[PDB]
Amino acid sequence: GPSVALFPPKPKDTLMISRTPEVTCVVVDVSHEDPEVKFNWYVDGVEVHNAKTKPREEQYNSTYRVVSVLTVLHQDWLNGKEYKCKVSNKALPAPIEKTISKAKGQPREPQVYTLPPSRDELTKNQVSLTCLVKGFYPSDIAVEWESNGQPENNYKTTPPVLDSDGSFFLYSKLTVDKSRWQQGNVFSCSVMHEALHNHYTQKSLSL
Amino acid sequence: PAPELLGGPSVALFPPKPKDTLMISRTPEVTCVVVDVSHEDPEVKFNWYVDGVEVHNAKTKPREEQYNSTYRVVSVLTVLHQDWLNGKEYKCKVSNKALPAPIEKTISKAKGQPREPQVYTLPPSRDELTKNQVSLTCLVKGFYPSDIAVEWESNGQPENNYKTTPPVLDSDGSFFLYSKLTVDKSRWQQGNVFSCSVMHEALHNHYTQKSLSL
Numbered sequence: 001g002p003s004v005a006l007f008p009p010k011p012k013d014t015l016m017i018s019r020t021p022e023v024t025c026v027v028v029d030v031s032h033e034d035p036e037v038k039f040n041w042y043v044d045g046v047e048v049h050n051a052k053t054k055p056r057e058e059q060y061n062s063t064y065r066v067v068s069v070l071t072v073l074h075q076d077w078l079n080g081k082e083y084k085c086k087v088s089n090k091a092l093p094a095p096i097e098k099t100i101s102k103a104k105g106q107p108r109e110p111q112v113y114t115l116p117p118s119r120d121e122l123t124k125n126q127v128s129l130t131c132l133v134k135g136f137y138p139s140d141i142a143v144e145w146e147s148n149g150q151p152e153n154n155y156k157t158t159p160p161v162l163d164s165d166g167s168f169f170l171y172s173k174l175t176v177d178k179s180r181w182q183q184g185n186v187f188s189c190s191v192m193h194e195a196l197h198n199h200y201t202q203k204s205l206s207l
Numbered sequence: 208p209a210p211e212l213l214g215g216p217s218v219a220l221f222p223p224k225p226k227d228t229l230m231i232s233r234t235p236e237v238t239c240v241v242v243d244v245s246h247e248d249p250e251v252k253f254n255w256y257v258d259g260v261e262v263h264n265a266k267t268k269p270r271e272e273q274y275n276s277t278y279r280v281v282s283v284l285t286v287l288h289q290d291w292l293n294g295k296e297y298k299c300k301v302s303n304k305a306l307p308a309p310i311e312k313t314i315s316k317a318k319g320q321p322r323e324p325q326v327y328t329l330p331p332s333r334d335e336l337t338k339n340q341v342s343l344t345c346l347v348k349g350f351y352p353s354d355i356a357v358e359w360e361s362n363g364q365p366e367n368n369y370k371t372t373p374p375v376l377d378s379d380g381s382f383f384l385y386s387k388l389t390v391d392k393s394r395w396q397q398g399n400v401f402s403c404s405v406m407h408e409a410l411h412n413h414y415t416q417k418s419l420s421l
């Protein structure tokens with residue numbers, strides 16, 4: 001029988017007004033015998049009718065996949081509204097329903113701290129610039145490193161880790177050639193999170 | 208979720224913890240875990256092999272009923288430090304009546320060149336000194352394989368108010384992580400010396416420490 005997964009928008013889409021966040025209902029294991037699928041969408045139980053449902057696509061195991069996509073208002077998602085995908089199929093005695101929303105709980109603002117490389121690291125050709133982001137809830141967050149108004153490529157960020165007070169934390173490591181560091185170039189760790197003013201802050205680091 | 212649908216047992220085979228393998232005093236175990244075992248058929252049978260030779264030293268623990276009816280069943284095989292670190296292979300064969308055939312899983316040490324971790328302790332940001340508790344960071348990078356243990360201490364005593372990130376794959380194919388120890392600012396300001404302890408197979412004596420203080 002059909003299976004339904006429901007996917008949330010990307011944090012960067014919800015945190016920036018000029019972008020379009022979307023919720024995505026994906027149905028799989030749709031039969032050749034019953035290929036036809038109907039989507040109803042609700043926002044806090046209020047049905048809405050502007051979802052874009054895509055034509056079904058047979059997968060390489062002879063089963064169909066049907067995707068329906070609902071654009072969401074930023075404020076609605078951030079105010080914790082519930083988004084419900086109801087999936088009707090002749091092979092379903094009752095419609096499948098999945099619901100999602102933002103993580104519930106008192107949102108908490110991240111604290112952002114940039115840490116220079118350890119003196120011990122200075123004897124190598126590349127150094128580590130560290131951005132610690134802690135005390136934030138929910139775990140959804142986007143962290144980016146940039147320099148001279150441009151993104152940096154050689155950085156990796158740990159996934160969020162549940163800290164002892166129920167908030168989350170992570171670290172982002174930027175690797176740069178030591179010479180760029182010694183020369184006094186300025187680096188910035190940018191953070192986006194719902195509980196920040198304007199959903200945004202940045203901290204800078206340099207010698 | 209008190210009733211029970213299904214489609215055969217599921218087996219996961221876990222390696223010994225880094226700390227048990229890197230210290231001769233401790234006891235490294237390989238653990239074979241079986242979930243989705245049916246109430247109708249709770250009997251599970253394990254066979255263990257080391258490079259194909261059957262061994263009999265394993266100890267299976269009593270079944271564990273989960274919130275669904277399904278049982279969980281665990282078998283634990285203690286391994287020799289040398290065997291694991293020299294790359295001997297451990298097979299767990301799981302037998303059950305809901306299975307059309309025995310499930311086999313194998314595990315062994317990561318092949319691929321070990322790389323020594325670099326350990327860097329990082330003091331709290333100036334900006335964090337406005338707060339009541341401060342963050343002491345230990346960056347451990349450039350290591351392979353990912354199996355690693357990081358702990359904190361001060362003055363001969365463990366310091367356990369920390370969290371450590373999972374290992375993250377870096378862009379050069381090695382791993383890194385960060386460990387954050389939270390201490391009262393007063394203890395930092397008092398000039399107490401804290402120490403990040405790292406255990407990994409590619410380290411001399413499988414052990415190194417880096418200290419951190421005001």
Ligand SMILES: *[C@@H]1O[C@H](COC2O[C@@H](C)[C@@H](O)[C@@H](O)[C@@H]2O)[C@@H](O[C@@H]2O[C@H](CO)[C@@H](O[C@@H]3O[C@H](CO[C@H]4O[C@H](CO)[C@@H](O)[C@H](O)[C@@H]4O[C@@H]4O[C@H](CO)[C@@H](O[C@@H]5O[C@H](CO)[C@H](O)[C@H](O)[C@H]5O)[C@H](O)[C@H]4NC(C)=O)[C@@H](O)[C@H](O[C@H]4O[C@H](CO)[C@@H](O)[C@H](O)[C@@H]4O[C@@H]4O[C@H](CO)[C@@H](O)[C@H](O)[C@H]4NC(C)=O)[C@@H]3O)[C@H](O)[C@H]2NC(C)=O)[C@H](O)[C@H]1NC(C)=O
Pocket residue numbers: 003005007008009010013021022023024026028029059060061062063065
């Ligand atoms: C026939 O083939 C089908 C397709 O493929 C294949 O065959 C060939 C082609 C192969 O080459 C290969 O491609 C395929 O094998 C098969 O389809 C399957 O069916 C699976 C089983 O149901 C299903 O697994 C679920 O996977 C989700 C995760 O999904 C996402 O990840 C997978 C893996 O990477 C992706 O494939 C998939 O596309 C999903 O990815 C996300 O898609 C979103 C929508 O597009 C993206 O978001 C949007 O992106 C746009 C971008 O333009 C925009 O940004 C929008 O804003 C945004 O919304 C998103 O970016 C993308 N993310 C990523 C990372 O890629 C899992 O979550 C599920 O796990 C849950 O259920 C299982 C049991 O079913 C359970 O064991 C788990 O524990 C999970 O349970 C939940 O648990 C959590 C906590 O753990 C709880 O919180 C929940 O309460 C609990 N809920 C439930 C209900 O239990 C599933 O494992 C596959 O995803 C699906 N594949 C595809 C392509 O659709 C099919 O099986 C085959 N049929 C047969 C008979 O063989």
Ligand SMILES: *[C@@H]1O[C@H](CO[C@@H]2O[C@@H](C)[C@@H](O)[C@@H](O)[C@@H]2O)[C@@H](O[C@@H]2O[C@H](CO)[C@@H](O[C@@H]3O[C@H](CO[C@H]4O[C@H](CO)[C@@H](O)[C@H](O)[C@@H]4O[C@@H]4O[C@H](CO)[C@@H](O[C@@H]5O[C@H](CO)[C@H](O)[C@H](O)[C@H]5O)[C@H](O)[C@H]4NC(C)=O)[C@@H](O)[C@H](O)[C@@H]3O)[C@H](O)[C@H]2NC(C)=O)[C@H](O)[C@H]1NC(C)=O
Pocket residue numbers: 212213217219221222223224227235236237238240242243273274275277279
């Ligand atoms: C029916 O319900 C069962 C039970 O599920 C859970 O129980 C129910 C009632 C709810 O409360 C659930 O929320 C709850 O999770 C369920 O069984 C689970 O099945 C899934 C597959 O569907 C298994 O998932 C996989 O997970 C793999 C990774 O799993 C480990 O890490 C998780 C944390 O993320 C733990 O929760 C697990 O218990 C497990 O822990 C590991 O355990 C091993 C051995 O015990 C440890 O190794 C040993 O550690 C000691 C330290 O004391 C020494 O160092 C030894 O040397 C060493 O060998 C290991 O350290 C530890 N790891 C950690 C991080 O703690 C993942 O890789 C797979 O991809 C997959 O996602 C899931 O693990 C399993 N749960 C358990 C507890 O086994 C059924 O699926 C349900 N069935 C249905 C139909 O609903």
